[PDB]
Amino acid sequence: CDVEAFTSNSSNDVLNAIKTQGASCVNALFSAESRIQEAAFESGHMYNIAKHTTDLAKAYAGGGSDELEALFLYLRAGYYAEFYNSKVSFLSWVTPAVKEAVDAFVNNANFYENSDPHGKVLSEVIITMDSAGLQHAYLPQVTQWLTRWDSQYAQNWYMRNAVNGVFTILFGGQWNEQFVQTIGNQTELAKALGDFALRSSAIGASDEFMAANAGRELGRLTKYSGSASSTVKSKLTEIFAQYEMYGRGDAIWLGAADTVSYYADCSDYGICNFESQLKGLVLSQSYTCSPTIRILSQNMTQDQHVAACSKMGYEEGYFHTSLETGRQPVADDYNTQLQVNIFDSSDDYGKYAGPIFNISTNNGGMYLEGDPATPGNIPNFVAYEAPYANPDHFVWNLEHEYVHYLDGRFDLYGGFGHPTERIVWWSEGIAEYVSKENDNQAAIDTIKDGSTFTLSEIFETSYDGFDVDRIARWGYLAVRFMFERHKDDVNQMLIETRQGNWANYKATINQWAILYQSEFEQWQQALVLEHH
Amino acid sequence: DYAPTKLLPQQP
Amino acid sequence: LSEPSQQVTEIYQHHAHQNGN
Ligand SMILES: [Ca+2]
Ligand SMILES: [Ca+2]
Ligand SMILES: [Ca+2]
Ligand SMILES: [Zn+2]
């Protein structure tokens, strides 16, 4: 691959680069430096490449096409770059050329072929329909794909990938005015979407995730009005009747229940309060570690419960000694016992945690402090077991996440959003320091590699960049440094954070960033040299 | 939040 | 509410935070 060859001002050079280097090298443009993106995705390049793609798509004879896969990937890579790069912004004549190229592939006699080579190009075409803002333009095709799908198509990895892209189209259509204006009247689409979700042959099959996505997008259709409304309702009713909230088809049932509940009246479907009934069914084991920790789990062994409780129990005492808490909670905080909610797997977490705890689940778990002052507030850590998690509890991220509960109750006044200064360095650093103590090779490695952060930079860390190196490793390094070399300052900072004096907290660590930078650097040196 | 798709998962 | 799931979902991710109402 040679990414520089996409920067030429001649569109023929760029086309030659796409053809000769292929989709695997085009992948680089999604994350290339801005200079390359502004040059690769000139409006003229997008136009000329779409015009070439139109002619190639018209001639396509089935059986896949490495070149068309690369061309459509490039075009939607351009829309990705345009969305995230303020210096990439297409002129108004780009998208009609892209729409013409999608049209050429859609109108081809081979559009509905079932093969993995076809699926590879078809995938990039369907995603381009969303990336290019064309969600309103191919609803008959979405309908045909939903109705044509069967177990033969489902054998092919790249056909599953491609057709699953129609749910991305439905989802992205929410921001498309022509789509919103028309989707409520798409009665055939609604029927095909419902019947796709109802395919019994999807249960336990490689395409079950698609039927689940269909159930979700069907429930989302209740946010629109029009001649399709009664078909949407009928099909949702059949989903809720055919499947159950826990058991066969529950990914489909719960996918639909989530959007129905948010956008519609749960009582029109008989699914009100389903979240609390689901919780009792999925999280059916209860194991009380102590007055301050209780586990609710889906399917853990007794050995796992005992090991989780003793690991958290050890961290709990270590936290209280290290943070010099006196076991005195902050004021206005009645989160007296952490509830640790452990699902059997990442998949189970993705299926059940969302509705039970009203959270997004594209993550490795999370701690919900809630509002500690409200009577009835429940502090919930939501997690899952994994085979490569830590023995002997095998709960992913348990030891780190548990510290957020203790830091929240004993160090930081208020709910999660109460601070009016940045505190990510402390929150994440103390969770790493308490849970890992001095066993942190990754933290050493990020000093050794030559790229470092100052105290001042660490204190400004945010979740925005999602720089996990800066957040977790350098957060840990700064916390460990302050504990080992300046514990009295930490105790002084904690007087302010415990009371919610966030300005005093900031003024306090501002002093650290100027005074201690050079010692922080020597401390890193000693840490590296100890490793050798 | 709407976000345009990056890459699709390849076959293992 | 969630976006549709891709064919592959990562098991060993970092945590999130915030809203669970
Ligand atoms: Ca288990
Ligand atoms: Ca708190
Ligand atoms: Ca580094
Ligand atoms: Zn954390």
Side-chain angles (χ1 to χ4, degrees):
Chain A
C1 303
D2 166 36
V3 65
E4 290 295 338
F6 299 101
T7 61
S8 184
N9 275 312
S10 161
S11 288
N12 262 75
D13 282 1
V14 183
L15 268 167
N16 189 87
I18 293 161
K19 173 163 92 183
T20 57
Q21 297 191 29
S24 64
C25 304
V26 170
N27 275 348
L29 298 176
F30 283 86
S31 58
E33 53 151 321
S34 179
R35 167 192 59 101
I36 298 187
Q37 291 190 334
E38 319 163 1
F41 301 128
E42 311 257 42
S43 291
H45 289 336
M46 293 285 291
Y47 175 92
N48 288 321
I49 286 156
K51 279 290 173 183
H52 172 78
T53 303
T54 290
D55 290 337
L56 256 205
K58 281 179 185 170
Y60 177 69
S65 165
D66 290 347
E67 191 174 352
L68 283 166
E69 179 195 0
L71 292 159
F72 279 103
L73 178 72
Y74 163 90
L75 295 173
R76 74 176 188 78
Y79 281 94
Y80 185 89
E82 178 198 49
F83 181 89
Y84 284 120
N85 193 321
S86 56
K87 313 182 71 173
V88 175
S89 182
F90 298 149
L91 299 150
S92 69
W93 37 269
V94 168
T95 297
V98 174
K99 199 270 180 183
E100 181 188 25
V102 172
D103 278 9
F105 197 81
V106 156
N107 291 332
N108 187 294
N110 302 280
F111 183 57
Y112 297 103
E113 169 178 322
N114 178 25
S115 74
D116 263 348
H118 181 73
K120 289 171 69 65
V121 49
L122 171 70
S123 280
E124 311 302 346
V125 176
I126 293 183
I127 296 313
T128 300
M129 293 175 177
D130 176 76
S131 311
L134 309 169
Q135 299 93 342
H136 65 286
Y138 303 98
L139 299 183
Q141 283 72 38
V142 169
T143 302
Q144 272 300 302
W145 273 120
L146 285 164
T147 192
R148 290 172 183 251
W149 189 260
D150 69 11
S151 59
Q152 296 206 117
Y153 279 112
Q155 293 332 292
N156 287 314
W157 172 281
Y158 292 97
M159 292 306 303
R160 298 194 302 268
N161 255 22
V163 173
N164 191 59
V166 306
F167 308 113
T168 297
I169 292 173
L170 293 181
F171 176 86
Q174 294 175 93
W175 292 269
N176 177 319
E177 298 171 71
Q178 257 172 310
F179 178 95
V180 170
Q181 179 173 54
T182 194
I183 184 62
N185 300 309
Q186 300 295 336
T187 303
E188 293 105 325
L189 195 156
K191 170 174 169 48
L193 186 60
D195 284 330
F196 186 101
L198 285 162
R199 273 184 71 247
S200 302
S201 59
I203 311 305
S206 70
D207 58 342
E208 189 188 300
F209 75 101
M210 302 172 68
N213 288 339
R216 184 176 302 105
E217 287 323 308
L218 178 66
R220 201 190 309 286
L221 293 187
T222 62
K223 80 184 272 177
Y224 314 105
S225 324
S227 42
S229 288
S230 62
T231 297
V232 171
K233 186 177 190 311
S234 177
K235 290 306 175 178
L236 285 165
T237 301
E238 308 186 342
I239 284 164
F240 294 139
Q242 174 165 317
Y243 296 135
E244 34 202 357
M245 70 172 71
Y246 188 57
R248 216 183 67 103
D250 51 20
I252 298 120
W253 197 107
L254 289 169
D258 178 44
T259 43
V260 160
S261 291
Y262 187 87
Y263 290 109
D265 193 332
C266 58
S267 68
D268 291 338
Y269 297 96
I271 66 159
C272 297
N273 317 307
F274 84 88
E275 302 91 339
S276 75
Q277 192 194 324
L278 180 70
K279 188 184 191 188
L281 289 161
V282 180
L283 294 173
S284 62
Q285 309 171 300
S286 175
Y287 189 94
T288 294
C289 303
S290 73
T292 56
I293 316 178
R294 178 165 58 174
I295 290 172
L296 302 189
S297 54
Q298 187 182 355
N299 181 215
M300 285 171 79
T301 71
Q302 159 104 354
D303 291 348
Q304 281 181 283
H305 284 150
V306 172
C309 291
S310 56
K311 172 57 69 170
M312 289 188 281
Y314 167 82
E315 287 185 80
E316 177 175 46
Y318 181 77
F319 169 89
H320 282 300
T321 308
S322 312
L323 275 297
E324 304 187 42
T325 62
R327 274 153 152 105
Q328 176 67 72
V330 302
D332 306 311
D333 184 314
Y334 314 112
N335 285 337
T336 64
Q337 182 189 54
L338 179 60
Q339 315 295 300
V340 183
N341 306 271
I342 302 162
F343 293 89
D344 195 47
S345 78
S346 167
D347 284 322
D348 287 284
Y349 176 75
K351 189 157 49 154
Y352 307 118
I356 293 170
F357 297 102
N358 193 7
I359 56 164
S360 98
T361 53
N362 42 37
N363 55 59
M366 72 171 67
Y367 171 55
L368 306 170
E369 184 176 13
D371 295 315
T374 301
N377 192 76
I378 302 307
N380 277 311
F381 171 40
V382 192
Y384 52 83
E385 317 164 63
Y388 293 89
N390 268 332
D392 297 307
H393 52 80
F394 300 95
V395 185
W396 183 239
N397 273 334
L398 175 67
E399 298 169 25
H400 170 108
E401 278 308 291
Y402 175 57
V403 179
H404 284 315
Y405 162 78
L406 297 171
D407 187 53
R409 176 159 165 77
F410 295 93
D411 298 328
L412 309 184
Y413 184 84
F416 169 71
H418 196 278
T420 52
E421 311 278 342
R422 296 196 162 114
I423 203 178
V424 173
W425 82 273
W426 167 267
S427 177
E428 302 299 332
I430 196 65
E432 288 289 88
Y433 186 43
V434 172
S435 66
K436 292 190 164 72
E437 295 186 35
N438 303 321
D439 187 2
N440 197 339
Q441 190 55 55
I444 296 183
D445 291 354
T446 200
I447 312 156
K448 285 167 41 168
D449 65 28
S451 68
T452 65
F453 289 99
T454 68
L455 291 174
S456 184
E457 297 173 313
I458 295 169
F459 296 162
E460 298 303 323
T461 301
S462 72
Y463 293 117
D464 300 339
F466 197 40
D467 186 352
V468 71
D469 173 69
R470 180 170 175 172
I471 293 163
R473 256 63 82 180
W474 284 96
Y476 166 95
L477 289 171
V479 169
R480 180 170 164 182
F481 165 76
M482 288 305 289
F483 269 70
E484 290 190 357
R485 299 294 187 83
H486 291 282
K487 176 54 125 63
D488 291 330
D489 285 344
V490 172
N491 281 328
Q492 175 186 329
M493 182 215 85
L494 290 164
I495 296 173
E496 310 307 324
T497 63
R498 280 162 182 160
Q499 305 179 64
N501 297 334
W502 304 114
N504 296 354
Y505 150 79
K506 184 57 161 183
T508 303
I509 76 176
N510 276 342
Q511 257 191 331
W512 304 348
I514 299 162
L515 272 58
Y516 302 151
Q517 179 56 41
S518 93
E519 191 198 346
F520 183 49
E521 276 166 49
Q522 193 268 139
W523 176 87
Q524 295 164 45
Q525 182 185 6
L527 201 71
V528 161
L529 295 175
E530 178 178 60
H531 158 76
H532 300 346
Chain B
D1 313 272
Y2 176 81
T5 304
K6 190 168 204 213
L7 311 185
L8 298 177
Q10 295 289 315
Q11 197 184 18
Chain C
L1 291 177
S2 192
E3 228 180 8
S5 293
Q6 278 188 345
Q7 177 146 211
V8 172
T9 292
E10 182 47 67
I11 304 174
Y12 302 95
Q13 306 189 38
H14 312 102
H15 70 91
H17 35 88
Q18 256 192 235
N19 197 313
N21 265 85

Short mmCIF file of all heavy atoms in Angstrom, two decimals, chain A residues 442-453 469 474, ligand 3:
data_model
loop_
_atom_site.label_atom_id
_atom_site.label_comp_id
_atom_site.label_asym_id
_atom_site.label_seq_id
_atom_site.Cartn_x
_atom_site.Cartn_y
_atom_site.Cartn_z
N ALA A 442 2.15 -2.16 31.61
CA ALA A 442 1.73 -1.21 30.58
C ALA A 442 2.08 0.23 30.97
O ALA A 442 2.47 1.03 30.11
CB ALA A 442 0.23 -1.33 30.32
N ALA A 443 1.97 0.57 32.25
CA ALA A 443 2.31 1.93 32.67
C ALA A 443 3.81 2.19 32.51
O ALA A 443 4.21 3.28 32.10
CB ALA A 443 1.88 2.16 34.12
N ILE A 444 4.64 1.21 32.86
CA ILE A 444 6.07 1.33 32.62
C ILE A 444 6.34 1.47 31.12
O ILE A 444 7.13 2.32 30.70
CB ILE A 444 6.82 0.12 33.21
CG1 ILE A 444 6.66 0.09 34.73
CG2 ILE A 444 8.29 0.15 32.80
CD1 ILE A 444 7.42 -1.03 35.41
N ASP A 445 5.68 0.65 30.31
CA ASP A 445 5.96 0.64 28.88
C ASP A 445 5.70 2.00 28.24
O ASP A 445 6.43 2.41 27.34
CB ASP A 445 5.16 -0.46 28.18
CG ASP A 445 5.64 -1.86 28.55
OD1 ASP A 445 6.67 -1.96 29.25
OD2 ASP A 445 4.99 -2.84 28.14
N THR A 446 4.69 2.73 28.71
CA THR A 446 4.40 4.01 28.08
C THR A 446 5.36 5.12 28.49
O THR A 446 5.36 6.17 27.85
CB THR A 446 2.96 4.47 28.37
OG1 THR A 446 2.57 5.45 27.39
CG2 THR A 446 2.84 5.09 29.76
N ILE A 447 6.13 4.93 29.56
CA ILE A 447 7.27 5.80 29.81
C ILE A 447 8.44 5.41 28.92
O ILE A 447 9.08 6.28 28.31
CB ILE A 447 7.69 5.74 31.30
CG1 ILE A 447 6.49 5.90 32.22
CG2 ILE A 447 8.77 6.78 31.59
CD1 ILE A 447 6.74 5.29 33.59
N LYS A 448 8.74 4.11 28.85
CA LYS A 448 9.89 3.63 28.09
C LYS A 448 9.80 4.01 26.61
O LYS A 448 10.83 4.25 25.97
CB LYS A 448 10.01 2.11 28.22
CG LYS A 448 10.55 1.62 29.57
CD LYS A 448 10.34 0.12 29.74
CE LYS A 448 10.61 -0.64 28.45
NZ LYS A 448 10.70 -2.11 28.67
N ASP A 449 8.59 4.07 26.04
CA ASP A 449 8.49 4.31 24.61
C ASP A 449 8.93 5.71 24.20
O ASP A 449 9.04 5.97 23.00
CB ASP A 449 7.05 4.03 24.13
CG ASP A 449 6.02 4.99 24.71
OD1 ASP A 449 6.35 6.15 25.05
OD2 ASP A 449 4.85 4.58 24.81
N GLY A 450 9.17 6.61 25.15
CA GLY A 450 9.68 7.93 24.88
C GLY A 450 8.64 9.04 24.86
O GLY A 450 9.01 10.21 24.97
N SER A 451 7.35 8.70 24.72
CA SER A 451 6.29 9.69 24.67
C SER A 451 5.62 9.77 26.05
O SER A 451 5.13 8.76 26.56
CB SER A 451 5.25 9.35 23.60
OG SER A 451 4.52 8.17 23.93
N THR A 452 5.61 10.96 26.63
CA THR A 452 5.14 11.13 28.00
C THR A 452 4.21 12.33 28.09
O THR A 452 4.06 13.11 27.15
CB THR A 452 6.31 11.32 28.98
OG1 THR A 452 6.98 12.55 28.68
CG2 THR A 452 7.30 10.17 28.88
N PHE A 453 3.61 12.48 29.27
CA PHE A 453 2.73 13.59 29.59
C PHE A 453 3.22 14.24 30.86
O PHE A 453 3.76 13.57 31.75
CB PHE A 453 1.27 13.14 29.82
CG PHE A 453 0.55 12.71 28.57
CD1 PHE A 453 0.43 11.36 28.26
CD2 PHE A 453 -0.06 13.64 27.74
CE1 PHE A 453 -0.26 10.95 27.12
CE2 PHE A 453 -0.76 13.23 26.60
CZ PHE A 453 -0.85 11.89 26.29
N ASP A 469 -4.34 5.36 26.82
CA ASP A 469 -2.98 5.55 27.33
C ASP A 469 -2.92 6.71 28.32
O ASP A 469 -2.41 6.56 29.43
CB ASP A 469 -2.02 5.79 26.16
CG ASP A 469 -0.61 6.16 26.61
OD1 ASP A 469 0.07 5.28 27.17
OD2 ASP A 469 -0.19 7.33 26.38
N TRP A 474 -1.46 7.00 32.31
CA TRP A 474 -0.89 8.21 32.89
C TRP A 474 -1.71 8.69 34.07
O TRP A 474 -1.16 9.27 35.00
CB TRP A 474 -0.73 9.28 31.81
CG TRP A 474 0.45 8.95 30.96
CD1 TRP A 474 0.45 8.30 29.75
CD2 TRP A 474 1.83 9.17 31.29
NE1 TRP A 474 1.74 8.14 29.30
CE2 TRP A 474 2.60 8.67 30.23
CE3 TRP A 474 2.47 9.77 32.38
CZ2 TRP A 474 4.00 8.74 30.22
CZ3 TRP A 474 3.87 9.85 32.37
CH2 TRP A 474 4.61 9.33 31.30
CA CA D 3 4.15 6.68 25.89
#
